[PDB]
Design an enzyme around this catalytic site. Structure first.
Site, PDB file in Angstrom:
ATOM      1  N   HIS A  91       0.807  -1.242   0.000  1.00 15.76           N
ATOM      2  CA  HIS A  91       0.000   0.000   0.000  1.00 15.76           C
ATOM      3  C   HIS A  91       0.830   1.277   0.000  1.00 15.76           C
ATOM      4  O   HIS A  91       0.372   2.273  -0.614  1.00 15.76           O
ATOM      5  CB  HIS A  91      -0.976   0.066   1.201  1.00 15.76           C
ATOM      6  CG  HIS A  91      -2.300  -0.563   0.882  1.00 15.76           C
ATOM      7  ND1 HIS A  91      -3.533  -0.017   1.137  1.00 15.76           N
ATOM      8  CD2 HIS A  91      -2.547  -1.728   0.217  1.00 15.76           C
ATOM      9  CE1 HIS A  91      -4.478  -0.855   0.724  1.00 15.76           C
ATOM     10  NE2 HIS A  91      -3.908  -1.887   0.139  1.00 15.76           N
TER      11      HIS A  91
ATOM     12  N   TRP B 231      -7.841 -16.794   1.537  1.00 14.27           N
ATOM     13  CA  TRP B 231      -7.646 -17.335   0.188  1.00 14.27           C
ATOM     14  C   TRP B 231      -7.249 -18.820   0.207  1.00 14.27           C
ATOM     15  O   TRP B 231      -7.340 -19.516  -0.837  1.00 14.27           O
ATOM     16  CB  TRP B 231      -6.635 -16.466  -0.505  1.00 14.27           C
ATOM     17  CG  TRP B 231      -7.021 -15.081  -0.897  1.00 14.27           C
ATOM     18  CD1 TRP B 231      -7.630 -14.694  -2.073  1.00 14.27           C
ATOM     19  CD2 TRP B 231      -6.797 -13.868  -0.143  1.00 14.27           C
ATOM     20  NE1 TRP B 231      -7.810 -13.329  -2.078  1.00 14.27           N
ATOM     21  CE2 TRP B 231      -7.303 -12.799  -0.918  1.00 14.27           C
ATOM     22  CE3 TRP B 231      -6.241 -13.617   1.101  1.00 14.27           C
ATOM     23  CZ2 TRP B 231      -7.244 -11.477  -0.504  1.00 14.27           C
ATOM     24  CZ3 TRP B 231      -6.173 -12.293   1.522  1.00 14.27           C
ATOM     25  CH2 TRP B 231      -6.667 -11.244   0.745  1.00 14.27           C
TER      26      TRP B 231
END
Ligand code: HEM
EC number: 1.11.1.5
Length: 291
Positions: free
Chosen positions: A49, A188
């Site tokens: 980020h 995930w």
């Protein structure tokens, strides 16, 4: 802009290895975070980020300035949940006040990856804290509810090609989505605090069902209890993307090498390294040091 790397005055390799060890020991110790996943994954997300705001067009954003430290960037809706990686590093910063922000934020990512048994990621020091006015405006991070075209287009702003995009996304093997943070829920895969090519295997091998979540967003859900964002899923909808996914599903080594290169590149975008600048450092893990 031109962002020339400037080594923290009088610091060498050993100085940095100590910062690394400090993060690593804290990772080891604060293991109860997020139901025992630990902070590894949040650190990797934080390093992506702070680096992902880069714009190859005017050289703004990227990891150089350590701008996440500023309210504007810190309160980016897309950064929700990162405050946890931030508070994790604070105590560390306090201990090694000479390290620039950008250097610390990016080193956490490397450390997390290496301590979670990922590949070795060469790292370079020299990022220099910049003024709050160099803080990039919000809205430079990608949306999750899009397709392969969006992704390709997006990544191009960061100079990443297909291979790089797919390598970097295998980072989705780590951590999970948090409804409260992003409007998405679920991991995930299973080993979400170990760096492996699990992401690709889940992608290829699960029977994905499109469903809407409680945030009223669509996600691909598998019976195993896993999820994939539309952006993840699009890696199998695009033909170029799919063959790379396959390669990685088939060769964890290849993936490790590609990731390594792509990750460093991501963290070094927008920075100019003078020829006299020290070579990229390769930190030893706690394990390699017997600590
Ligand atoms: C299309 C590009 C991407 C999109 C749309 C995306 C989106 C997201 C979203 C929505 C979350 C969940 C946040 C939460 O609810 O806590 C997430 C988590 C995460 N992202 Fe991705 N991401 C992308 C690329 C990347 C890249 C390039 C990396 C690093 C190479 C990365 C690393 C991570 C990690 C490690 C997590 C889990 C963090 C945790 O467990 O707190 N992502 N991402």
């Amino acid at each position: 802009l031109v962002h020339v790397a400037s080594v923290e005055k009088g610091r060498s390799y050993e100085d940095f290895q100590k910062v690394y060890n400090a993060i690593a020991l804290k990772l080891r110790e604060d293991d109860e975070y997020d139901n025992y996943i630990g902070y590894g994954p949040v650190l990797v997300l934080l390093a992506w980020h702070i680096s992902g705001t880069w714009d190859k067009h005017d050289n703004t954003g990227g990891s150089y300035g350590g701008t996440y430290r500023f309210k504007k960037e810190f309160n980016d809706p897309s950064n929700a949940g990162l405050q946890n990686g931030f508070k994790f590093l604070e105590p560390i910063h306090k201990e090694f006040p000479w390290i620039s922000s950008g250097d610390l934020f990016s080193l956490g990512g490397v450390t997390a990856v290496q301590e979670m048994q990922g590949p070795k990621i060469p790292w370079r020091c020299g990022r220099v804290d910049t003024p709050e006015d160099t803080t990039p405006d919000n809205g430079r991070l990608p949306d999750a509810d899009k397709d392969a075209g969006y992704v390709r287009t997006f990544f191009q702003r960061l100079n990443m090609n297909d291979r790089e995009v797919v390598a970097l996304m295998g980072a989705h093997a780590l951590g999970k989505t948090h409804l409260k943070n992003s409007g998405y829920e679920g991991p995930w895969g299973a080993a979400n605090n170990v760096f492996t090519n699990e992401f690709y295997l889940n992608l290829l091998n699960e029977d994905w069902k499109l469903e809407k979540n409680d945030a009223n967003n669509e996600q691909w859900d598998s019976k195993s209890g896993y999820m994939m964002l539309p952006t993840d899923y699009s890696l199998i909808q695009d033909p170029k993307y799919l063959s790379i996914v396959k390669e990685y599903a088939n060769d964890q080594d290849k993936f490790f090498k590609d990731f390594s290169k792509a990750f460093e590149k991501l963290l070094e975008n927008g920075i100019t390294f003078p020829k006299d600048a020290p070579s990229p450092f390769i930190f030893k893990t706690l394990e390699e040091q017997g600590l």
